[PDB]
Symmetry: C2
Subunit: 340 residues, 2 copies
């Protein structure tokens, strides 16, 4: 397992420090499940899909960290320390739960480490495959020669590889369609300007960066043919939690009769919730808002709010692109079909 | 004439360097009509209202710069050099035109300089007064104990003093109403986080700064009672041109049944245009987007778009707060009444 986002050295997990791009391309080596937790918590690694696989490995390292007392209790704490990092994206729990299950069924096997590491590996290789499929299904919805607006970074850096929303793009381009992407810088973290822009230019795909308060006007001016974004948590309802600001675009998209698509793997669909009001919303540190890449921009001692995600009601979504097909209204009715 | 935004030393114009706040509070001295132009062009001074008075003074300096040839041709050029700075805000032309008229009628007067400078001063003293009236008229629309979202900086630093949209706030507070403001940082320039936050904290008014992609969700969550912003150019139609991102707020406001108010002096209403499609929209340098206040944030050699304003159709505006009253639908019909 070796890609731009992460690399598995058998006994450690290397993560591209996404909080340092687009200028610095260094890596962070995680050796302790606590470090992977830290890398996730600090957003060194990020993007629902990639948080899971990365979480799965930190779990494997979790075993390699074991020393005394009960193995079960300790593996339970490793899982708890990793899950306690970031709320919203359900991929994290989905990964952890899948891994813990393997564990409970091989805890007595002497080749435990080999077995667990194997699933994590099996998992990463599936994400890239799942993504290329999402890209393929989404491509058919993108008419040649169009301008697609995106949000956050639902691409290579947000997954093991290829990406979800950006995967749909790479696939349309691969099919041979002239395409250009308007990418919101997406503050405060600036995934758009620092990550999406970067991996897209590095792939030879036409890219423009715009401030978040621009998307609206540009849609009204008729420069955007479609809006495609990723997700962190989709409910049985179809409501999807994604990077703060995704909701507003959805609203603006309806007002300008512009298709709004959510590209995400089935693993992002939380089967335990009915609607989007049940999705936990992460609140991050005040620094992210008062600063911008290092420098403080707001006055000293100012109050702020910092939700990292918002929720878009399903009625504002045209369709959900999955590795198993394009889901359309009635969502609750169709998602239930795909789930099985 | 002495306020935080600008000061008239009789033979030079001192402008608070708004592109350095909230940390550095230095001033820039303009002695040539060209320097005032430069200050305007670079946004050392900014905010429709303040751009006018500042332009009016750079005009008197224009006379002070006179040396040879025809006095009329030179003053015409001074006016042209000053008007060629920033497109959108009509306050600039309104000011320049008012000043040139005074000039044309006193050109042969021995006390020309004293006369022209006198109008400029008379103009500054009127703006502050006009604002306090806008503030008062708007205060009545704000219910005690409410949370108000603003955009850009339509406050003290955008006018000679007091401000327009923020004037409405200062006034509601003066009346004795518990009030707090959610101020969008407003990228790329960050007028919100750097200016609105600053002058509001310095006035002892509860303030929170949020990234632009947040307003939408926060409105849906029910934390915002009303949205009040300023304007750069309002048409007879009622459509108003304001800082890029204002249009989206208006849209998000309608969706969440939230009052949207535009506070601006009559001098911002352009009488020569019928609708908002006739408003010129300024496009500024790409650096403003690829950089954030100081450091480069986007990849080297990336494409971007940079509109400095967008247009909000009148049908999305609840009312326009003026020093002459609260204008309501039918705008075209009512605005025609306020003008006469
Ligand atoms: Cl709807
Ligand atoms: Cl409407």
């Amino acid at each position: 397992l070796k890609t731009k986002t992460m690399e598995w050295s058998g006994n450690s997990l290397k993560l591209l420090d996404q909080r340092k791009l687009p200028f610095i391309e260094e890596y962070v080596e995680c050796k302790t499940h606590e470090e992977v937790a830290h890398a996730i918590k600090e957003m060194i690694v990020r993007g629902a899909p990639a948080i899971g696989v990365a979480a799965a490995f930190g779990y494997v390292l979790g075993l390699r960290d074991y020393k005394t007392g009960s193995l079960t209790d300790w593996m339970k704490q490793v899982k708890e320390t990793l899950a306690r990092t970031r709320p919203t994206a359900v991929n994290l729990f989905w990964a952890l739960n899948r891994m813990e299950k393997v564990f409970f069924e091989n805890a007595d096997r002497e080749n435990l480490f080999e077995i667990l590491e194997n699933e994590a590996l099996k998992m990463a290789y599936e994400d890239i495959e799942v993504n290329k499929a999402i890209g393929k299904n989404g491509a058919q919805l993108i008419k040649d020669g169009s301008t697609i607006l995106t949000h956050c970074n639902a691409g290579a850096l947000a997954t093991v590889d290829y990406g979800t929303a950006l995967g749909v793009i790479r696939a349309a381009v691969e099919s041979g369609k002239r395409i250009r992407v308007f990418a919101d810088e997406t503050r405060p973290y600036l995934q758009g300007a620092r990550l999406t822009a970067w991996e897209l230019m590095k792939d030879g795909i036409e890219v423009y960066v715009i401030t978040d308060n621009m998307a609206g006007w540009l849609m009204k001016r008729g420069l955007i043919d479609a809006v495609v974004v990723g997700a962190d948590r989709i409910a049985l309802n179809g409501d999807t939690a994604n990077k703060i600001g995704t909701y507003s675009l959805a609203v603006l998209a309806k007002r300008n009769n512009i298709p709004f698509y959510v590209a995400a793997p089935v693993s992002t669909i939380d089967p335990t919730i009915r609607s989007g009001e049940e999705i936990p919303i992460e609140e991050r540190r005040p620094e992210e808002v008062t600063h911008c890449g290092g420098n403080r921009i707001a006055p000293e001692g100012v109050k702020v709010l910092n939700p990292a995600f918002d929720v878009t009601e399903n009625t504002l979504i045209t369709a959900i692109i999955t590795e198993k097909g394009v889901i359309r209204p009635p969502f609750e009715e169709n998602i239930k079909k795909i789930l099985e």
